[PDB]
Each structure stands twice: as structure tokens, then as C-alpha cells.
Paper text:
Leptin, a hormone primarily secreted by adipocytes, regulates energy balance and systemic metabolism through its interaction with the leptin receptor (LEPR). Here, we report the x-ray crystal structures of a leptin-neutralizing antibody (hLep3) in the unbound and leptin-bound states.
Using papain digestion, we prepared a Fab from the LepAb, which we subjected to crystallization either in complex with human leptin or alone. (D) The superposition of the unbound Fab (orange) and Fab:leptin complex (light chain, cyan; heavy chain, light blue) shows conformational changes, with a root mean square deviation of 0.44 Å for 220 Cα atoms. The largest difference occurs in the CDR H3 loop (heavy chain residues 100 to 107), where residues 102 to 107 are unmodeled in the unbound Fab because of a lack of interpretable electron density. Notably, we observe only minor conformational changes in the Fab upon complex formation. Consistent with other antibody:antigen complexes, the Fab antibody undergoes limited induced fit upon leptin binding, enhancing shape complementarity at the interface.
Author numbering:
A (entry chain A): 2 to 101, 108 to 135, 143 to 222
B (entry chain B): 3 to 57, 60 to 111, 114 to 213
């Protein structure tokens, strides 16, 4: 079984967001689906839950009046709608199945509540018995971006560092890879950056 | 509702015990205590359920007494460093609520490796300049980063990250100095200094 969730979203303070949670095999309805948020650096917060087959929902007192948990047994998809968003709601929202203890969690959906606007990155190449090359993913918003090398063929010596929120409100990240110096002439190294919030994908070749 | 120690640490092969205490409305009165493991940058996983049952290696175990529960990890491994959350049903508030979480750390000091990248030619042609000082493979997390242009401390344009955890249980970090092409060309050298447990590594680049 697997629980798949909708993509990351950017919303402005006061708007409403709706995160989905579809099943990939099982009796989605006879189980319960819990929704739990986690803010950056904080712990888990049980927002609520629902048993679909019966249609019955429960909400923690904290998010009561703002959160609506619904479920479809046909599509086997739960939905959590949060209204009147705030800067503090910015967090990753997980859905977790549990027979009616949570044993099947989802990948999590990042919901960013900020009056800013989504922007794609500028990917610059950082040129070099060991040389080190890399890629600088600058001036993008919001988190996250994903970086691979040779489309995944290169994993040896790869290090993707955490981003930094620049004073401009845009993030900047770096991913480096250490390689033999002698191979710099023959082999080709390309970093593949993907920023799904802005639907950007860039394959930048790092040349000496 | 549930109280957890903010952090626990132990060397490889040791037995660690994380506690989770509440009142008679949650852990007391019968309601079981679940234990979840969250690895750096991942979704939680169910370690223990029903106070002592496993879905999970035998090294992990759980116990419950009175208004307290405890998770025991024997033969500590590097893969065990992670956040541990205890969950229980509160009867007064009527709902399943987590604890503060415990950051289990698996422990030898280690000085950092620093790599300084100067601005790209393309970036300079894009009316931008960014020097990148990458730090890796240092334990503990504490680390200071300072920038100097021609020996004068640069304090404007500096953006540094807080030490994050690597996959090898050590730490990494990154610092960025933002300049205009003319600023970068008007000095003869820039340098980043990474201080860690009294030992500083300094790297320098020059136009």
C-alpha cells in the first residue's frame, strides 16, 4: 500500500488550500486517515482524522473551525482543506493511514503561506588527486529544489547542502561532487536541478 | 501533553532510554503509547505500538509503568540517530497527541573540510557575484563563519546556514557572500574562515 499526496503549494495569508491523499491499494475506506502537520523545526501536530466508509471526522480543538477533513471511498482519496491561512500554518502536512496507530504515512505536502511569489532558480556552474565541481541554485522560492548528477548516474561524492534564505527572501542552494582530476577531460558532469513550485528543470554542464 | 527529553546521546553499542511522561488521563488509565522514528528529512515511521509490540528490529523495545513510558534502543547504531516521538490518546482533550520529541544523537570530534568557490563567469556576466564557502564533515554542529576581503571583515551580504546533519551523522553548512562584479574585482582576495572547537580553517580566492 502507498499513500500519495498532492504537490507543494504557495498560498497567500487568508486564502484556502486543499491537500489530497489517494491510496494505491487496500481497503482505504475501512481504515482511518489522520492528518498531521509539522512546521520547520517543530514536532508533529495531530490536526485530525476521518473514517471514510462511515464518513465520520474528528478535529483537534486547535484547528477546529478552520480545517475540513473529507474522504471519498470511491476514489479512495482523503482531503484536508485549511481556510484562513496564516504565516504560521506554513508547514508540511502528512496523511497517515491507521486501522480502526499510524503505520502508513504519506510523502508530505509542503504548504507555504507567504505574500511572496514563486520564482525559478538561476543555476550557475562552479568549476574546479581530487577535484570538486558543483552547481549553485540561486534566487528561487519557495522550497524545495531537487538536484541530481548525470540524471542519477553519479552518486559518488555528491553532497547537496541545505538552502539559505537570503535577505532578498529568495533561497540559494549548492550541490557539489568530488571526482578524479584525470577524468575532467573525458567524462561529462551535468547537474539536473528541478524546482516544481515554478515547474522549472535545468541541466547545466559544469566544465573546467 | 506528553513530555520528552529534548535530547539523548550515546556511543555506538550502548543502550539508550527515551522517556515519555503524562498524567492519568493519557498514559495512565490504559491508553497505549506509540513510538515513531523520523530520520533527517523523512516522514515518520511506526517503531513501537501498544507499549511493547513491533511492526522494526528487535533492538527497539518499549515499556509502560504508571504514568510513564520508555523506549529502549540496545546496540545503538549510526542509523538510529533521529527524532523519536511518543503518541498517546488524551481522554480529557479527546484526541491522539504527540510529545515534544527526543533527538537521539549517536556519538569523536572532527575538524571541518572547507571548499571556496569564486563567482562564475556567467554569474558576473549576469551582473551578479556570489562566493560560496561550503563546510562539511565536522562534529559537533557548532561552527562560526566569517568573511574577509583584503583582511577587512565583510559583514554585509553574508548569508550562512545553521549546521545541518549529514547522512554520516556529522554536520555540514554553507555560507554565501553576495557582491557586484565591480566589488569582486576591486579587491585582491576574499576569504572565509570556519571556526570549530578553537580550530579555524581559512580558504582564499583571488580575481
Amino acid at each position: 500500500v502507498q499513500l500519495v499526496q498532492s504537490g507543494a503549494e504557495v498560498k497567500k495569508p487568508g486564502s484556502s488550500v486543499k491537500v489530497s491523499c489517494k491510496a494505491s491499494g487496500g481497503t482505504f475506506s475501512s481504515y482511518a486517515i489522520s492528518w498531521v502537520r509539522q512546521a520547520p523545526g517543530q514536532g508533529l501536530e495531530w490536526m485530525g482524522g476521518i473514517i471514510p466508509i462511515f464518513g465520520t471526522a474528528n478535529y483537534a480543538q486547535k484547528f477546529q473551525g478552520r480545517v475540513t477533513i473529507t474522504a471519498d471511498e470511491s476514489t479512495s482519496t482523503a482531503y484536508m482543506e485549511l481556510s484562513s491561512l496564516r504565516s504560521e500554518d506554513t508547514a508540511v502536512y502528512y496523511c497517515a493511514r491507521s486501522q480502526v496507530g499510524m503505520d502508513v504515512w504519506g510523502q508530505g505536502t509542503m504548504v507555504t503561506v507567504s505574500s511572496a511569489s514563486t520564482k525559478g532558480p538561476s543555476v550557475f556552474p562552479l568549476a574546479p588527486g581530487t577535484a570538486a565541481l558543483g552547481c549553485l541554485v540561486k534566487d528561487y522560492f519557495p522550497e524545495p529544489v531537487t538536484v541530481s548528477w548525470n540524471s542519477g548516474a553519479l552518486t559518488s561524492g555528491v553532497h547537496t547542502f541545505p538552502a539559505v534564505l537570503q535577505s532578498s527572501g529568495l533561497y540559494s542552494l549548492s550541490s557539489v561532487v568530488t571526482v578524479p582530476s584525470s577524468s575532467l577531460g573525458t567524462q561529462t558532469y551535468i547537474c539536473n536541478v528541478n524546482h516544481k513550485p515554478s515547474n522549472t528543470k535545468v541541466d547545466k554542464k559544469v566544465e573546467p | 501533553v506528553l513530555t520528552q527529553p529534548p535530547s539523548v546521546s550515546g556511543a555506538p553499542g550502548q543502550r539508550v532510554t527515551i522517556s515519555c511522561t503524562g498524567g492519568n488521563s493519557n498514559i495512565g488509565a490504559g491508553y497505549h503509547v506509540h513510538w515513531y522514528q523520523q530520520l533527517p528529512g523523512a516522514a515518520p515511521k511506526l517503531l513501537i505500538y501498544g507499549d511493547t509490540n513491533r511492526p522494526v528490529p528487535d533492538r527497539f523495545s518499549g515499556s509502560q509503568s504508571g504514568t510513564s513510558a520508555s523506549l529502549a534502543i540496545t546496540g545503538l547504531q549510526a542509523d538510529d540517530e533521529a527524532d523519536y516521538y511518543c503518541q498517546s490518546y488524551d481522554r480529557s482533550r479527546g484526541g491522539w497527541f504527540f510529545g515534544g520529541g527526543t533527538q537521539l544523537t549517536v556519538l569523536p570530534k572532527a575538524a571541518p573540510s572547507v571548499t571556496l568557490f569564486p563567482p562564475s563567469s556567467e554569474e558576473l556576466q549576469a551582473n551578479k557575484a556570489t562566493l560560496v564557502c561550503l563546510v562539511s564533515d565536522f562534529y559537533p554542529g557548532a561552527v562560526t563563519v566569517a568573511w574577509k576581503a583584503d583582511g577587512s571583515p565583510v559583514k554585509v551580504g553574508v548569508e550562512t546556514t545553521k549546521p545541518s546533519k549529514q547522512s554520516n551523522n556529522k554536520y555540514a553548512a554553507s555560507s554565501y557572500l553576495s557582491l557586484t562584479p565591480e566589488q569582486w574585482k576591486s579587491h585582491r582576495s576574499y576569504s572565509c574562515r570556519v571556526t570549530h572547537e578553537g580550530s579555524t580553517v581559512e580558504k582564499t580566492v583571488a580575481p
